[PDB]
C-alpha cells in the first residue's frame, strides 16, 4: 500500500499530497489527467456509518454544477476485506471560509457566489433534501470562482410535518449558522433552516466576519435578537411551545438594528435580500426560488438554467445495526467496481 504520512491505498491515482481531516489527500488522476481530492473514510461507530451512507446516497443521486460530485469510490471487492472507503472528488483550490479570512470580496463576487449557492440549494430542496450545515467551510471554490456545496453528513429528507420539538433540544449543526427556531421549537426538518444559513453566509461575505458568533446555545439566539430585535406579537403567537414562548417574553426589549448601519458599504439590493433571508418567522422567510428571482441576482437569474432534481427522495431513509449499514455502504458503492 502507498503510505501518505498512514495507509492511503488509491491504482489510477499516482502522485500524492496530504491535506487535513479519516484523512484527505490531493492526488493525480491518470484517466482524466487532472489532480483530484481523495477522502479516506474508515467509519465501520454506527454514527459514522449512518452519516457516510446518507452522504454517499445523496451525492450519487445528485448531478449539479454547484454540488460536489463523487467521481470515483475505491473499496475492497468484498465486505470482509472492506475496512476503508476512498471518495474521489474534483480538486477545489479553496473554500469560502479560507477566502474570507484574507480577501475582501467585490459586490460582483458576492452576487456571483450567492447566485451559485442558491442555484445549488434550489436543486437540493427540489430533491426534498435539506443540507442542514451550510457555512463558508462547506462552499468549495476553484481559481475561476466556480462554487460547489459539499458536506452532506448532516443532510436529511425534509419532514416539516414532524419538525416540532421542545425548547433547547440538542442540535449538531454549526452554532453560528443555526436558525432561531432550532433553539426554540424546531428539529431542523424544514427548508427554511437552509435559507437562514445562506443569509448568515451573505452577511459574512459583506463584512468578512460571522454576523451571529454566539458562544453557546442561548447566546446564539441573543446575538440574533440583538440585530433583528424582539420578535413581534404575531411571530410569538406562532410559538405554541410554552417554555420557548416564556423564554422570549423573559428577555429585555431590543430594537432592530438596520442592515445599512451594519453594512454601510453594501448594495441596497443585497441588504433587501439579506433582510428576507434573515427573517425570524420561518413561514415568512424567503424561499430559495424567490431569492433567485430577487433583484440583487437579476444579472444571473435564468430558471431554464437552474435545474431541479430528476429523482427526489420521497421518504425518510430510516436509522439499523452497523453490519446492515456496512452492507448498505457496500451495495451503494458497487457501481465504481
Query: 3-state secondary structure string, the chain?
Result: CCECCCECCCCCEEEEEECCCCCEEEEEECCCCEEEEEEEECCCCHHHHHHHHHHHHHHHHCCCCCECCCCEEECCCCCCCCCCEEEEEECCCEEHHHHHHHCCCCHHHHHHHHHHHHHHHHHHHHCCEECCCCCHHHEEECCCCCEEECCCCCCEECCHHHCECCCCCCCCCCHHHCCHHHHHCECCCCCHHHHHHHHHHHHHHHHCCCCCCCCCHHHHHHHHHHHHCCCCHHHHHCCCCHHHHHHHHHCCCCCCCCHHHHCCCCCHHHHHHHHHHCCCCCCCCCCHHHHHCCHHHCCCCCHHHCCCCCCCCCCCCCCCCHHHHHHHHHHHCHHHC
Residue 82, annotated as binding a ligand: no
Question: Are 73 and 336 contacting, i.e. CB atoms less than 8 angstroms apart?
Answer: yes
Please answer whether residues 182 and 197 qualify as being in contact, where contact means their C-beta atoms are separated by less than 8 angstroms. Answer: no
The gap from C-alpha 32 to its chain's centroid, in whole angstroms, comes to: 28
**205 in a known ligand binding site:** no
- Check if the beta carbon of residue 307 is closer than 8 Å to that of residue 64: yes
Pairing relation of β-strands 147-149 and 156-157?
unpaired
The region that residue 238 occupies, defined by phi over 0 for left and psi between -120 and 50 for alpha, beta otherwise, is alpha
Residue 229 counted as an annotated binding residue: no
Q: Does 21 belong to an annotated binding site?
A: yes
Inter-CA distances, 141 with 13, 200, 302, Å? 22, 18, 22
CB 272 within 8 A of CB 87: no
C-alpha–C-alpha distance, residues 42 and 23, integer Å: 9
Which experimental technique did the depositors report for determining this structure? Answer: X-ray
Resolution (A): 1.7
Asked whether the beta carbons of 272 and 293 are under 8 A apart, the reply is no
> After what residues is the chain interrupted, C–N > 2.5 A?
5, 10, 21, 44, 319
Positions marked catalytic: 133
Q: Is 36 annotated as a binding residue?
A: no
Q: Hey, what's the cell of 213?
A: 458568533
Residue 118 near residue 125 (C-beta atoms within 8 A): no
Strand partners, 39: 24, 87
- Residue 337, C-alpha cell as written in the block: 467496481
Cell reading at 114: 450567492
Give the C-alpha separation, 88 to 10, whole Å: 9
Residue 164 phi, psi (nearest 5): -75, 145
Phi-psi region of 52 (alpha: psi -120 to 50; beta: other; left: phi over 0): alpha
Instruction: Look up cell 460571522; give the residue.
Output: 210
CA atoms within 13 A on the CB side of 86: 20
- Binding residue per annotation — 20? yes
If you search the block for the grid coordinates 479516506, which residue do you land on? 40
CATH of domain 94-305: 1.10.510.10
Sheet arrangement for strand 147-149: 94-95, 139-141, 147-149
> How many CA atoms does the CB half-sphere of 95 hold within 13 Å?
14
Say how far apart CA 103 and CA 9 lie, in whole Å. Answer: 36
Q: 288: exposed, middle or buried (C-beta count within 10 Å: 0-12, 13-18, 19+)? A: buried
Residue 303: CA count within 13 A, CB half-sphere: 6
Amino acid at each position: 500500500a502507498a503510505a501518505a504520512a498512514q495507509v492511503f491505498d488509491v491504482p489510477r491515482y499516482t502522485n500524492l499530497s496530504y491535506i487535513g481531516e479519516g484523512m484527505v489527500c490531493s492526488a493525480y488522476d491518470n484517466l482524466n489527467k487532472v489532480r483530484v481530492a481523495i477522502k479516506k473514510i474508515s467509519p465501520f461507530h454506527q454514527t459514522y456509518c449512518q452519516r457516510t451512507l446518507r452522504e454517499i446516497k445523496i451525492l450519487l443521486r445528485f448531478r449539479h454544477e454547484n454540488i460536489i460530485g463523487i467521481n470515483d469510490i475505491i473499496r475492497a471487492p468484498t465486505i470482509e476485506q472492506m475496512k476503508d472507503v476512498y471518495i474521489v472528488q474534483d480538486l477545489m483550490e479553496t473554500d469560502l471560509y479560507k477566502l474570507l479570512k484574507t480577501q475582501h470580496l467585490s459586490n460582483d463576487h458576492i452576487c456571483y457566489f450567492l447566485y451559485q449557492i442558491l442555484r445549488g440549494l434550489k436543486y437540493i430542496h427540489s430533491a426534498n433534501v435539506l443540507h442542514r450545515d451550510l457555512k463558508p467551510s462547506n462552499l468549495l471554490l476553484n481559481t475561476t470562482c466556480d462554487l460547489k456545496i459539499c458536506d452532506f453528513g448532516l443532510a436529511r429528507v425534509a419532514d416539516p410535518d414532524h419538525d416540532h420539538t421542545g425548547f433547547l433540544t440538542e442540535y449538531v449543526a454549526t452554532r453560528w449558522y443555526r436558525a432561531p427556531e432550532i433553539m426554540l421549537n424546531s428539529k431542523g426538518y424544514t427548508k427554511s433552516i437552509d435559507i437562514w444559513s445562506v443569509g448568515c453566509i451573505l452577511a459574512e461575505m459583506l463584512s468578512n466576519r460571522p454576523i451571529f458568533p454566539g458562544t453557546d446555545h442561548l447566546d446564539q439566539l441573543n446575538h440574533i435578537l440583538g440585530i433583528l430585535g424582539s420578535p413581534s406579537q404575531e411571530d410569538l403567537n406562532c410559538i405554541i411551545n410554552l417554555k420557548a414562548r416564556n423564554y422570549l417574553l423573559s428577555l429585555p426589549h431590543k430594537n432592530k438594528v438596520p442592515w445599512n448601519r451594519l453594512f454601510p458599504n453594501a448594495d441596497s439590493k443585497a441588504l433587501d435580500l439579506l433582510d428576507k433571508m434573515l427573517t425570524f418567522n420561518p413561514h415568512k422567510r424567503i424561499e430559495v426560488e424567490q431569492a433567485l428571482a430577487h433583484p440583487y441576482l437579476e444579472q444571473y437569474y435564468d430558471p431554464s438554467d437552474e435545474p431541479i432534481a430528476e429523482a427526489p427522495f420521497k421518504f425518510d431513509m430510516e436509522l439499523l445495526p452497523k453490519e446492515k449499514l456496512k452492507e448498505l455502504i457496500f451495495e451503494e458503492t458497487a457501481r465504481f467496481q
